[PDB]
Design an enzyme around this catalytic site. Structure first.
Site, PDB file in Angstrom:
ATOM      1  CD  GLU A  19     -26.562  47.789  67.365  1.00 18.35           C
ATOM      2  OE1 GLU A  19     -27.134  48.901  67.411  1.00 18.35           O
ATOM      3  OE2 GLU A  19     -25.873  47.431  66.394  1.00 18.35           O
ATOM      4  CE  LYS A  60     -26.320  46.679  62.410  1.00 18.03           C
ATOM      5  NZ  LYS A  60     -26.070  47.882  63.251  1.00 18.03           N
ATOM      6  CB  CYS A  82     -29.059  48.115  64.853  1.00 19.26           C
ATOM      7  SG  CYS A  82     -29.472  49.883  65.168  1.00 19.26           S
TER       8      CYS A  82
END
Lengths: 295, 297, 301, 298, 297, 296
Positions: free
Chosen positions: D45, D118, D155
């Protein structure tokens, strides 16, 4: 299946209870002449206040919920066994509408339609009072029939009549308030107004009812007195657009016309205008300027 | 002639002891009621220090359930005794969720429900995002004995969408309990003028009065990286329906602000101006995006 | 010098073999519940359908009539007396008859003997050795949590333990500990299948993702059932265990011993850990509609 | 052993705060992975620089760049096309006034297949992502690549069973999670590495799909509004099988190229046969659309 | 006087080759068309042997997506060629879900959509619960060129609720593709008379005609525990709107059954009987329980 | 092996004299008992001619309250004397409401309560509408000394929903007292086969036995327009749990039908067949509508 329909034409004072007494007396007479569905003219609760553009007149509006006039016609509708579309000035939080409540044969309130096309100009300053309608065009399934109910200025638009006929409308109804225009006495719209509606009837093959008020009304506007002579001519047209019943411009009237709905539907289905339509070529009707689709 | 309502904004300093602060709020609610108030507004998270300067595990446990809350229950007695409407701000625990919430107490003591803060701020001194799930009640209006009111919380005050949402639902007065001052990382930031102007804008665009109650005093909190200090700048105020400030406190004084509004004339003024008649919801779809193109799910 | 504050609760997982006689198995249960209580246990978990053999290896008409109503159930009533005597919470797994519907159920008995209600198994397994779909209507109580004298607990049954949705539904409603009575082992149609490690990792994943401890009680022993197509055997593989709020296994049994597992949790510290980690603050229900589909596109009615 | 096979790779490396250097590093390792037979290679990431989210700084927000004509995406498209490998590219997206932690999925022919933004945004000392990113609004996605239908999330999303299930339900055959996780600067006693692995292994086993996690290594010091803040990233990049078994794993400080082959036809058959998807009860999952266990969100 | 529709039930034995079986369907559809059929019903899972006698991993992979299904596509051509409506039963794969489904092809070749089997049977010889997720389409009706029809699948035919749901939504005719025969664990079970009586009941309670197409032949499946044999018993039939059987096949030969219905005279007869205006949905809440007490969620 | 219960369907012609009909009911209940019956079903409104043909004001006064009903009380004495369950059909007066009702008498003579007919039709020969309000009891089951039973009345018997509602609640046997015959407007419809098929349907779909008692004979009532006549077609029958007719009467003579059922075997069969395990109430919401769209 034989539904009887009526057009009512009366004069108004600027007093709610006297006016409702008038509608209530003419509706009972309609029912005496055999009426199933009774139409009451536009904003009959009072004078046609839209000549002026006054702040206090906006506060004449009331909520749809527990409306005193809707509630009083529901009792009358239920007792007679007649369908009655009720014109009123609606308040909805900060929105305002020119609206109509369809009260079925058992007094049931079947919902509301909000005027879509809003007129404007001297004597008819409706754009100052009403948000343009957000219900869309509607059909109301009543014990006697499926009915297309729109309001006044909506009667000039073929799109409204066509939308209602596409949704199952066996009959179209239009509560109206129209007459002279205070800025120019040379303007006589009565023939032109009948003609446009006659066209919707013949193009869709559905009978039509227009109730219009009469009498003289003087409003105290922000710029001095303003007067309208409402010209009546409340009528009932057949599925070919022919005038079967018609009132005059001055006198009070209770019109009646009986329609064989199952046979008018065979007349409509055989002519086949609805199966013959070309929606693929009508996208331009979604533009205002004839090129740009609206968002 | 018309329904009149007297509204009030309160401004005070807080210790980190609940009993003291609630005692302080009570004293000021009584003083507002003595001056004729019908609806009294207490500042955000008044039960203690503005703990959000820190991002601490243990501070999360300051939260309490809405059900049988001792501060709401205590203030419900006051409301009823006085005939006053009291929005009560508190840190809510709801199973594993947490919210910055507010319960609306009616003039008869009745808990009319809650609003959960929708827009959650972040950054040095105001680390609210660490503590609160974004609100899931949506914007609300509450029918009190004196008026339909719209109550949102602190950071919500910067969003025209929140004030507009409340007004569309019939809010006749907007209320924003607040906790705002200096920012500990940069002494040159002074947001008080900006803060007022944005709110005056909401009041003028919706033609509804607006009440903002803000904290005063210096508060020093121990954080994960040492001491952090905020000087809360007060400036509590009441704005009328064209956005004009009718009552305003300074940046240090304890204050009780009073203002009377005629709600029938204001309704009448609001409709007349025509903004709600002229809105174009058909062209507002872009507001359901964050990035100016992609509608949210 | 003082102990660390917080509500402590001692949980226990039991592991034993059953015969097909109800009296023998309830006697076994009671002996082990008492042994668990002797070791300090507050909440004791008995394995799935402990009253008899795991009969679901067969699809038989006569086995459906082993169900009994929830009302005045002899086993529930008997364990109610034990719970009250010892002051322990006992979930009681049983085959329920409810007019023409049948369910794989569990009644939660509180530490004062009060029957707090039931949960009906939601996810029903199928295939050789585990033909449950033949016996049980899918559960209609939805996922539940029960407020006991010691803790708010989430209890689900066997196959339910493979579904992250169930564990999360319980955690969202405040469950502080999860319980899963289990009956799992070998598969009679294929001896190469050994699901025990797979089984553990899924549940450890639930405990870690929700930051709540988790108790699984599984059966041991070999059982032979007479089916419509001949005898069928399962070797139940034990491995009952207790896992902490990061998914760490704190206690575990082997695949053949009778066991009483014991672990103490500080519910107040774990609550604080759970909230600080922030997963519940960060969830996105607005993006979870697809979870209400089976095929990834169409929401179920 | 018949069936479509696919080789996946997890890369693990240390970053500087210079973009050109870090992209050179990524290209070096993607080529090493390809040399070992990889078809889909996962880069960690925000690999273009230091993990800047330890700080909450105005100027760090301006490291964001548009999705359109993004130089790092364009450069890696060339490499994807040259090698015939699928490459998800993590980046900091500017989109008018919104900002996202994003990932663009590059196919083996070099085609940009689209982006995932995300959804779950972490917060707290050392990991102040809520200050920079609007919570994602693409929803959970799956991408049809030359080798497989894959699910890529980012993540913190890896802690949420809902995201894995969403991807699996939509046909994802492998799950990928680029990561940046290590120590926490306010409390040196916190060591999340086993907890982190256990939760992902849970996802792999509950959905019966393989899972690839690529994590950063090395120490990074960021100058924050309150002084220096340091994180030691702990690596532990790994590849898990469809029962949650770790098949390949890196240590906490080595640069690494991990490799695993999967038979997607056999795993699909196993997945369906185990029956979890046949047995799901969405009619009982409405509580998942609440935060508080009681109130459905608007 | 009125809208007439000729319907057909087909009955045949399946082989283990897909193309052979679709060609068998094609041959019989043309034979129905020749005899005047407008809507023709092919039996359940006609593409192959009834594989559900076994609970096998590899049999699940026989499923195929709805999109670009070769059997549906091939039958669309036949529908368009002959101007006949053809419901096509198939084993659907939809990402990780699987269903026992049916696609309704209109007389012009158009795919009108699908119904997924709601009630999934179980037990020796009929282990369907191992393969299919319970359907999530709910009961549907399709508007074809000839009639609004209700199509449900096999086991669905034992449930008065399915038949009522479809008629309430305007179904003019019910269709039930079926695979039912002996049961391998008990030779004393002969369900054919019971099976007909229940459907005849649906026709009579709703006053709509009903069509059922069942398989014939002995099929031996290699299960996880050895050979399992079912003798499929045919008895495909067409029933009129009072439940009278007007055409029926035997238990061992291929059949093309044909019946004409005057749908407007039947509509009139249904309206006159009035059962539908006389229902008491206010008293049917218990139907939303499984156990007679607790409503499902 | 298991609980065995013997049920009976009675069939006779009514006169328009109450005493005579009650004496007839009693004679046939005794005959049934003599043949081993435990539960005996008398046809609908047996106290007189089927009066719902006409819509007359004076007929409304044939109604009597549930409390202290002379026919119910007399049949309670007979139930206790013989040890038989007797559901008693009667015309109920309850304030401004009237109902077509039935009271369930247990083998000890205990009045177990009532069910009020729910579905109310129109049409010549059976103008039920003018005399009976829609039942407000809902569908019920009654626990008797011999079984849990479900009882519904005449027109209710066309509705699968009522049979299902009773079965879901434990009914092990369904009872349907009725009155059906020709229609005075057109003598071409013969509904006896349609009627049997629908009921066999309910027995087979719920896997419960079903008993139907229907009257025989011709009946002439003077009405508003003029003489209305009806020929009731009998065909009372008892069906088993697969819907097979195990006992049936003809259209012209008195009958006492007898059939024994093993309720434990039947319960085992019902559960094994699996329909109740397989129901989808999550897909049945449309059944709480009349028009197939809007809930009521």
């Amino acid at each position: 299946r034989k539904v009887v329909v009526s057009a009512l034409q009366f004069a108004c004072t600027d007093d709610v209870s006297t006016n409702v007494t008038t509608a209530e007396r003419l509706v009972r007479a309609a029912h005496k002449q055999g009426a199933n569905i009774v139409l009451i003219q536009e904003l009959f609760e009072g004078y046609y206040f839209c000549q002026a553009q006054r702040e206090d007149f906006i506060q004449r509006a009331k909520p749809y919920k527990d409306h005193p006039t809707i509630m009083r016609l529901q009792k009358l509708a239920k007792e007679l066994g007649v369908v009655i579309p009720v014109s009123f000035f609606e308040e909805a939080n900060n929105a305002h509408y020119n609206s109509i409540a369809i009260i079925d044969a058992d007094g049931t309130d079947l919902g509301i339609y909000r005027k879509s096309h809003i007129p404007d100009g001297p004597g008819y300053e409706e754009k100052f009072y009403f948000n343009p309608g957000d219900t869309g065009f509607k059909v109301f399934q009543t014990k006697y029939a499926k009915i297309g109910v729109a309001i006044c200025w909506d009667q000039w638009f073929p799109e409204a009549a066509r939308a209602m006929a596409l949704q199952g409308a066996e009959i179209l109804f239009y509560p109206t308030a129209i007459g002279s225009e205070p800025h120019d006495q040379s303007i006589d719209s009565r023939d032109h107004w009948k003609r446009v509606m006659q066209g919707h009837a013949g193009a869709n093959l559905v009978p039509l009812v227009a109730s219009n008020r009469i009498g003289n009304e003087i409003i105290e506007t922000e710029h001095g007195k303003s007067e309208i002579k409402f010209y009546g001519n409340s009528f009932i047209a057949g599925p070919t657009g022919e005038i079967v019943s018609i009132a005059d411009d001055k006198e009070e009237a209770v019109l009646i016309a009986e329609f064989n709905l199952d046979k008018i539907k065979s007349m409509r289905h055989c002519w086949g205008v609805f199966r013959d339509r070309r929606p693929d070529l009508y996208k331009v009707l979604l533009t205002l300027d004839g090129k740009n689709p609206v968002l």
